[PDB]
Amino acid sequence: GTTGERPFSDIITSVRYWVIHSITIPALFIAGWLFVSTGLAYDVFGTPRPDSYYAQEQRSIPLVTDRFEAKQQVETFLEQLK
Amino acid sequence: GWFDILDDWLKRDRFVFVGWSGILLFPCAYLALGGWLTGTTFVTSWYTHGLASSYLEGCNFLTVAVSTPANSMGHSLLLLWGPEAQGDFTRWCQLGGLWTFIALHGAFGLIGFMLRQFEIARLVGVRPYNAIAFSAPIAVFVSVFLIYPLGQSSWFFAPSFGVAAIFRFLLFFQGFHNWTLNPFHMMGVAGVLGGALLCAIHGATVENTLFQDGEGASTFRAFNPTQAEETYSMVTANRFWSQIFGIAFSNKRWLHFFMLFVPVTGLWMSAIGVVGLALNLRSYDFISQEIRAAEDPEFETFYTKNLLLNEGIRAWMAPQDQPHENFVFPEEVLPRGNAL
Amino acid sequence: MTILFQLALAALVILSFVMVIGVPVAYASPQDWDRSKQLIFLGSGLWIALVLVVGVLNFFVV
Amino acid sequence: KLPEAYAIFDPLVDVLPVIPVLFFALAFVVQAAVGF
Amino acid sequence: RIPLWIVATVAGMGVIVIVGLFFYGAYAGLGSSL
Amino acid sequence: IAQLTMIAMIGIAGPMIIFLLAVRRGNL
Amino acid sequence: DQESSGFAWWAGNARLINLSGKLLGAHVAHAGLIVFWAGAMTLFELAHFIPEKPMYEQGLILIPHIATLGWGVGPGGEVVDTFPFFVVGVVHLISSAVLGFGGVYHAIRGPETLEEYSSFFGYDWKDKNKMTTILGFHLIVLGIGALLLVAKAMFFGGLYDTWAPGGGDVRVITNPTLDPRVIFGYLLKSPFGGEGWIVSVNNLEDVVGGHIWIGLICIAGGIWHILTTPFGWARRAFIWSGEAYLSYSLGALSMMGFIATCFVWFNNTVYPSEFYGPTGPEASQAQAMTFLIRDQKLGANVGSAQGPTGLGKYLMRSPTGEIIFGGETMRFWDFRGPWLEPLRGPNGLDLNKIKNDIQPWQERRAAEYMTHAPLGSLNSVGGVATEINSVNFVSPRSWLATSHFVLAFFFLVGHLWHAGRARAAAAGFEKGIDRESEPVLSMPSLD
Amino acid sequence: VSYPIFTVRWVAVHTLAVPTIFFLGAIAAMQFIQR
Amino acid sequence: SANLWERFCNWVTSTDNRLYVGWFGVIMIPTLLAATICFVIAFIAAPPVDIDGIREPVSGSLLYGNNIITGAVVPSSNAIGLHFYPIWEAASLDEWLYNGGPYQLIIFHFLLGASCYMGRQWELSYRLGMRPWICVAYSAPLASAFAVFLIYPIGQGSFSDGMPLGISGTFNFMIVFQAEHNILMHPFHQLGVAGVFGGALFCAMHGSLVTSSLIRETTETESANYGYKFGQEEETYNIVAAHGYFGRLIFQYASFNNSRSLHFFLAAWRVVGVWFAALGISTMAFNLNGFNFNHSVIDAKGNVINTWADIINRANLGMEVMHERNAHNFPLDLA
Ligand SMILES: CCCCCCCCCCCCCCCCCC(=O)OC[C@H](CO[C@@H]1O[C@H](CO[C@H]2O[C@H](CO)[C@H](O)[C@H](O)[C@H]2O)[C@H](O)[C@H](O)[C@H]1O)OC(=O)CCCCCCCCCCCCCCCCC
Ligand code: CLA
Ligand code: CLA
Ligand code: CLA
Ligand code: CLA
Ligand code: CLA
Ligand SMILES: C=Cc1c(C)c2cc3nc(c4c5[nH]c(cc6nc(cc1[nH]2)C(C)=C6CC)c(C)c5C(=O)[C@@H]4C(=O)OC)[C@@H](CCC(=O)OC/C=C(\C)CCC[C@@H](C)CCC[C@@H](C)CCCC(C)C)[C@H]3C
Ligand SMILES: CCCCCCCCCCCCCCCC(=O)O[C@H](COC(=O)CCCCCCCCCCCC)CO[C@@H]1O[C@@H](CO)[C@H](O)[C@H](O)[C@@H]1O
Ligand SMILES: CC1=C(/C=C/C(C)=C\C=C/C(C)=C/C=C/C=C(C)/C=C/C=C(C)/C=C/C2=C(C)CCCC2(C)C)C(C)(C)CCC1
Ligand SMILES: CC1=C(/C=C/C(C)=C\C=C/C(C)=C/C=C/C=C(C)/C=C\C=C(C)\C=C\C2=C(C)CCCC2(C)C)C(C)(C)CCC1
Ligand SMILES: CC1=C(\C=C/C(C)=C\C=C/C(C)=C/C=C/C=C(C)/C=C/C=C(C)/C=C/C2=C(C)CCCC2(C)C)C(C)(C)CCC1
Ligand SMILES: [Fe+2]
């Protein structure tokens, strides 16, 4: 079939591709990295960090009990929880 | 015009087709890929299974999975802005949510994508049939990600959107639904499996009955993209299996069609079967046996011998698989043979 | 000997890493099949010799 | 752990085995430069 | 302009280096067992 | 410890022969 | 040979099957990676080898072989000379250069056609004699060391023999085997459980003893083919084409590799376990041994103990040989190793012996083998399918036996695709099926 | 001729290529989060 | 005639006998004829079998109480394991019966003649003069059947644990396995379920398109399928209008115009994955089981965080424990 949208080999092999990108690609690679390093990713998605999955003493699991006052639960767990 | 401008535009070629469909395919489908992805990389699934579900937590490819909502929610769509989460993208990310998301957004991606199969199809003067065949998965994905869960207790027991987390989905059935022994599921493997052969064979059967119509060691180029010329002697075909297997796929409209059927069909038989599992209607049963299983403590079929494996799969996993029940099984109650 | 050796062996490696990239480009670029021919015999005996050198050398430090 | 006098090279000894593979790899690099 | 193969191999090694990192990362990585 | 840097060189030893061959000529 | 007038890129090496190979050098080229690989891994192995840690406990596939030959071991499977191992890899490795240094040449700067330079035996496949004579060389070649080994076995140091009097220990094979009934007899031996035709081999006397017989037998072949031309039913029978030659030849490996995979999993003789892990059956027999002791030592009668099933826990009965360990362990009543043979009897395991002559050096070797068993995950967490991460160990036998099968399998796949394409030249329909002259579109319709 | 840099084709190829490296970097980062 | 065998020689190789019977034929043909005959009966009416190392007879004959699904002809007992238990080695016919000797017969037989069919799978591609990378497709299949009947047995030492010939039997051979090999977590089986799923998807794909760009030749009353005659010279489908569609439906270039390549892709995908799989079993045959990440994810204090694989493993123990209750007379299922 007749195809005509801006070619690929062109730019993957392009001089400009590598010059705009070289600098920006790792900008994302780095950006992601920082997202992890700051440790914000954790707070970003509640995702606990090894240091804080279980409180110190307790052995039970901080399980969400009631679907409607769930927000509380999480807290009261994340609460007593270190 | 005003419509046709939108049409005219979005409708013509431009490499990556984008159509009347795309409007829902692309968005839903995207989010969906993302939806699953973000979870595996950053989102935890602890507050629902006390189980780690993210690279970030340390999980690997085969470990990561985007949880599934605690048995406390049930089937509530668990909305980001709904009463449960209240647009708290961290809690909402915590109460699982992403699930209903990935699943619902996803559920459209399919609806949407199949449409696209129609759109591009009605625009190119072909038979939609491909779009039909595609029910094969919609039915599965519908039943297996919405219906079954919707039939059980909570979104929880629904698939897992994991690699291993999904393997759990198997066993758990074998162990509780003893699916393995359910006619419907059977045709489900009768079709997939049966079809795969059908595929691997037509593919190779074709390659060999290829007319040397090129020059040298590259029968891959010798083919004409341009015009009609049966590349594989249909005659050198039948007279082959007719003598090697006793049968001849004499015709190509049916051959290249019967291949459409095989799978799609079985899949449905699967989707039906599981529909059963939704309302716990399962094929564990097999009275004729079990009734005589009572007396004759010495008669044993694989069925029973197998059925027993199941009975172990329960007793051991239920306590940790179904955490919200706070099951407790003392050292004693656990079923075991003499030895381990 | 214990001191001399470590430079002797590490020589053999910088010579082989060399000897390697060498011949390859050599048989490839026949323009200097006539001159590089010797850049190929250079390492060679010095390489073989460098190995027989690590020779009596190893039976002397351990 | 190689003879004491080789202490310096545990690092290379470490890699040497990867090479074999490396060859099927290169075989491609060339085939690619030579447009198949 | 820039030769095509040269972009492939350097693009590739990255996948082979990044992927390699990931395997190491499973040994000391949080997900190790220590 | 060092192991990694020294592996690096050997690994890029092969594509370098391809490069040194691109510039000069032959092979073809 | 460029593209056109050749195959595609993936079938690259086919254009080397054209004219006279530009390079033997390819074959030599890698005939090096193969020898270099020993040079790296061997170095790498020792590079990680500790003398105390059981050789099989430290992923040693390569190193255990040197030991099995009598090098760097002696009393018990203990390693005294970290040197010998190092030696062999160092040599090979370096040895590889010459092998590669040359193959690398023969392929680019030498005669792009040795068909012409021919003279010296030379090149062309159909040439029925150049081939009979060639293999002929490589026949004297092999048998060559068959003796090389016999020497190491009889004139340079000996081998490791677990059976050997005292206990595992480097010993010299004094009296190899004469009698052809024995050395040959194995081939005629059962293939199934109880007697594997190749595998079953108690001692070295029959090994080195047999190798001898093979060196000469094999040399007598090179000497043979080198001098003559294959008969007419031979020509009549087998297709001759460079490819076709690989085709056969390749399916000798397939088979052979299985013969390895099936061998490295089963023998304690040529694979001592002091260097490899305890053989699969040995394991579930070792367990037996350990617990027969645990209770007997705890005060149980053992011999007369009625087991859960109806058979008996510690001791059971087999159909042909009367007495063996009982569990599910039975499957392996054919297992034989020095750690359990003393406690053997006329009728089988002896109650009197097992009860009082069962010494300590056994309870501890028995327990090592109970633990260290050929069970692990790719993850490399040695143990039952469902064990916690902690003790990890994968038997050399696991990797060895496993790999070779997948490869040897795959090869069998090869023997096919290379016979499938080669039996095709034989008539010329290999390129395809001629659009105007196909046998079928002109044949009596089956009905 | 002169084909734009802001192509339909491109918007897509991007929504992916941006995150991917954002993620890949995120992950290569985790590879060390001990303790 | 000079010799009468001359005719036997062309007959076997009769390129026109309704059903070709090559040289492999002459072995296949009956090896399966005996194999089948023993089978069909063993199912219909055969005594129980002590299978497991004990004397617990497992019944598997319709006439002995089997539904078609429960049906199965059972293996040889851990008593024999690998020894060759042919019909003569057994004293009373009934011995062979009880100790489960049909298995070996059925298994050994088909498992053999099967391969010859694989040979005679190609022998017709020679007498017929067609490219023959066909017989190989058939491998993957035969490999597995060989794997599940011959490798694994030699692997664990007894034909005892070789996928019992019967419906519910397989299910058994399976659930057990998972338990002792975590097969499901095995990289190989993956690449297996990979293709199978694929092929089963491609089988519906390539079958879909063709019929979707079928071409003209019918009414609405007529069966569109009728539009074609055996021995057509030009294919029935309009390939250009097909790729012209599918290609478009997401990417345009992730599509096939090269019919030879496509039909090929269909071959190799299923056939390659299936191989890995066939190898998967054959891999764990000597205990290189699937992955294992139990307790592999932990927090600071060491309190253990269950991996979604720990459940896999939980449900795994439930399996480990029960399977073959009574025999297992020791702590470790070392077989
Ligand atoms: C009798 C007629 C039978 C008809 C069958 C016809 C079917 C057609 C053939 C196809 C496959 C079936 C053939 C069976 C071959 C497999 C070997 C086997 O089963 O026999 C089992 C024996 C095992 O030997 C073991 O030998 C042991 C002895 O060792 C013990 O005792 C020794 C000293 O005696 C040592 O002390 C040692 O340490 C100790 O462990 C015991 O006696 C065991 O009971 C015994 O099992 O293996 C061996 O020796 C034999 C090794 C042969 C090489 C095979 C390679 C691997 C098999 C691959 C199959 C290829 C087919 C693939 C097709 C699909 C795609 C490829
Ligand atoms: C795996 C081992 C192997 C070997 C021994 C060969 C050998 C060969 N291939 Mg080949 N090939 C292979 C794998 C191999 N191939 C694979 C896996 C593929 C799939 C991509 C191919 C695809 C392929 C194609 C399409 C073709 C060949 C061809 C050839 C032949 C031409 C060689 C040449 O021109 O090199 C040229 C060499 C260069 C351009 C530079 C490479 C530098 C190498 C030789 C040196 C490296 C040595 C090492 C790095 C350091 C040692 C130095 C030493 C002095 C110490 C030669 C017989 C050609 C043929 O048809 O022959 C008649 C051909 O057209 N191959
Ligand atoms: C005869 C083939 C063979 C066998 C049986 C082994 C076996 C072993 N090797 Mg090994 N190795 C080999 C060839 C082999 N190697 C070669 C050619 C090299 C040079 C590159 C190495 C370099 C090497 C290193 C650096 C190390 C090992 C180690 C090991 C041990 C543990 C490895 C493991 O558990 O990961 C399992 C690995 C896999 C499951 C790879 C997955 C396979 C994928 C890629 C697909 C493969 C498909 C194909 C059919 C198989 C290819 C065959 C293989 C040669 C690649 C194990 C005994 C480790 C060890 O024990 O240290 C002392 C170790 O550190 N090897
Ligand atoms: C492995 C099997 C093998 C086989 C069958 C061959 C066969 C051949 N090689 Mg060869 N080669 C090999 C391995 C092999 N090679 C390896 C591993 C290398 C690495 C260097 C080489 C390097 C090499 C070179 C540079 C040349 C050959 C050549 C040849 C051809 C000349 C035959 C001749 O009369 O030599 C007979 C040789 C002997 C009987 C050995 C004599 C040993 C002493 C008495 C003197 C040898 C010189 C000295 C010892 C060191 C050699 C230096 C070197 C320049 C030769 C012949 C086809 C020549 C060729 O171009 O063929 C067309 C050629 O120029 N080869
Ligand atoms: C190393 C690789 C190799 C290769 C590729 C060959 C290839 C060949 N050799 Mg040969 N050979 C080799 C090594 C090799 N040889 C070695 C190392 C020796 C040492 C002697 C010989 C000695 C030798 C001799 C004396 C002869 C050959 C011959 C041949 C040719 C015919 C072989 C044939 O097709 O057998 C096909 C044979 C069969 C299929 C046998 C089928 C019949 C069965 C039933 C035998 C009956 C079994 C009996 C009861 C005993 C046990 C049976 C069973 C229970 C095990 C063929 C070109 C013949 C040739 O023409 O010139 C030499 C020949 O006369 N070779
Ligand atoms: C490239 C991948 C690869 C790697 C890393 C290995 C590695 C190994 N193989 Mg092996 N193998 C492979 C592919 C590989 N193999 C393939 C594709 C086949 C065909 C199916 C085989 C068939 C095979 C057999 C039959 C045996 C091995 C053995 C071995 C081990 C000893 C090496 C050896 O025998 O030295 C030099 C040779 C010996 C020490 C014994 C020679 C055996 C006699 C001479 C019969 C013929 C040898 C054999 C056919 C030649 C293959 C040698 C190998 C280096 C390729 C070693 C771990 C041996 C083993 O089990 O451990 C000791 C062994 O008996 N392999
Ligand atoms: C083995 C599982 C399986 C996979 C994963 C799979 C994948 C796919 N099948 C497709 C097509 C098809 N499959 C078909 C029949 C079948 N397909 C089958 C089985 C599969 N098919 C079986 C059951 C039948 C056999 C015939 C037909 C013939 C087609 C099509 O022609 C089509 C195709 O042309 O492929 C090339 C492609 C359509 C792409 C698409 O619609 O994206 C656009 C929109 C999507 C997919 C967004 C959906 C978002 C939803 C699903 C969210 C889900 C997120 C989680 C599931 C991700 C979790 C990841 C895990 C690791 C947990 C591709 C997605
Ligand atoms: C040969 C190729 C040919 C075709 C077949 C190839 C099959 C290859 C299979 C490999 C898949 C899994 C990779 C190993 C996992 C691993 O180990 O990497 C992990 C994340 O992986 C990953 O993130 C897997 C990446 C896959 C995501 C694909 C999403 C699809 C969208 C892509 C769009 C691109 C435009 C990171 O490590 C994990 O997380 C770490 C924490 O940082 C832990 O420490 C552990 O290491 C844990 O394993
Ligand atoms: C140091 C030393 C040495 C050297 C050596 C060598 C020679 C090495 C090598 C090397 C090499 C030489 C390696 C490798 C290779 C290769 C490469 C580096 C490649 C590549 C890459 C990539 C990444 C690619 C990619 C791709 C893609 C993308 C797809 C397909 C195609 C291709 C392949 C291109 C030795 C060892 C001898 C020892 C002594 C010293
Ligand atoms: C969720 C979310 C979202 C979105 C999202 C996203 C954005 C996602 C993402 C993303 C993505 C998009 C991701 C992904 C991807 C990718 C990647 C990152 C990949 C991967 C990886 C890997 C690792 C790979 C590997 C490989 C390959 C690639 C193939 C072959 C083999 C190998 C290995 C090479 C929304 C808005 C809806 C909402 C909010 C949140
Ligand atoms: C694949 C091929 C190729 C190439 C090549 C080949 C194939 C081969 C070979 C071979 C080779 C490539 C070889 C070699 C070599 C050499 C070596 C491998 C060496 C060495 C040495 C060493 C390694 C050493 C080191 C050391 C010493 C000296 C002593 C002490 C220790 C140390 C470590 C220091 C190509 C791609 C072009 C294509 C064609 C084929
Ligand atoms: Fe088709």
Side-chain angles (χ1 to χ4, degrees), chain G residues 295-296 299-306 314 351 355:
Chain G
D295 312 0
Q296 184 185 67
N301 64 274
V302 214
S304 180
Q306 183 183 185
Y314 334 64
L351 189 290
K355 257 225 258 282

Side-chain angles (χ1 to χ4, degrees), chain D residues 3-30:
Chain D
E4 194 67 293
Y6 290 97
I8 327 161
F9 301 62
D10 178 59
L12 275 323
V13 196
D14 268 87
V15 195
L16 313 175
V18 198
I19 305 297
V21 154
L22 302 196
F23 280 34
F24 140 23
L26 195 66
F28 267 34
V29 127
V30 132

Side-chain angles (χ1 to χ4, degrees), chain B residues 19-29 32 101-120 130-132 134-142 146, chain I residues 249:
Chain B
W20 255 169
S21 49
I23 324 189
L24 102 174
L25 159 91
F26 260 95
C28 305
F101 179 101
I102 305 166
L104 282 178
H105 279 198
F108 293 109
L110 302 321
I111 306 160
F113 170 101
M114 186 182 269
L115 304 160
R116 254 202 45 175
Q117 293 176 306
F118 275 118
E119 192 155 6
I120 280 194
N130 157 270
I132 295 178
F134 193 77
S135 82
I138 302 188
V140 190
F141 187 93
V142 166
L146 305 93
Chain I
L249 184 62

Side-chain angles (χ1 to χ4, degrees), chain I residues 10-48:
Chain I
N10 57 69
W11 188 62
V12 180
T13 312
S14 155
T15 213
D16 65 48
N17 259 323
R18 179 64 198 60
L19 245 72
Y20 180 41
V21 34
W23 282 126
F24 292 128
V26 86
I27 271 156
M28 177 183 97
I29 274 301
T31 274
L32 300 310
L33 266 262
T36 181
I37 278 301
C38 190
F39 187 56
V40 294
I41 293 176
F43 206 64
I44 295 182

Side-chain angles (χ1 to χ4, degrees), chain G residues 37 61-62 65 253-254 256-257 260 264 271 276 400 404 407-408 411:
Chain G
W37 177 78
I61 40 186
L62 235 300
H65 300 94
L253 306 159
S254 190
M256 208 135 25
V264 73
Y271 296 92
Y276 306 87
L400 270 54
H404 295 49
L407 299 206
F411 271 35

Side-chain angles (χ1 to χ4, degrees), chain G residues 132 135 138-139 142 187-188 214 216-222 224-225 228-231 233-234 237-238 240 248-249:
Chain G
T132 169
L135 132 158
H138 308 63
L139 286 187
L142 278 53
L187 283 92
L188 303 321
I214 213 296
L216 281 50
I217 286 180
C218 153
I219 281 177
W224 190 300
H225 294 235
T228 40
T229 294
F231 306 49
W233 45 246
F238 334 2
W240 319 59
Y248 307 147
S249 278

Side-chain angles (χ1 to χ4, degrees), chain B residues 33 36-37 40-41 54-62 64, chain E residues 19 21-32, chain H residues 16-17 20 24 26-33, chain I residues 191:
Chain B
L33 188 78
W36 168 70
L37 283 148
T40 68
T41 15
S54 175
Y55 302 132
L56 176 73
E57 307 203 76
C59 297
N60 59 69
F61 173 57
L62 306 170
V64 288
Chain E
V19 124
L21 164 87
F22 297 133
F23 276 14
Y24 150 84
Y27 282 63
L30 257 179
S32 144
Chain H
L16 307 185
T20 297
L24 257 284
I27 305 148
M30 310 186 257
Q31 293 308 64
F32 309 91
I33 342 158
Chain I
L191 303 194

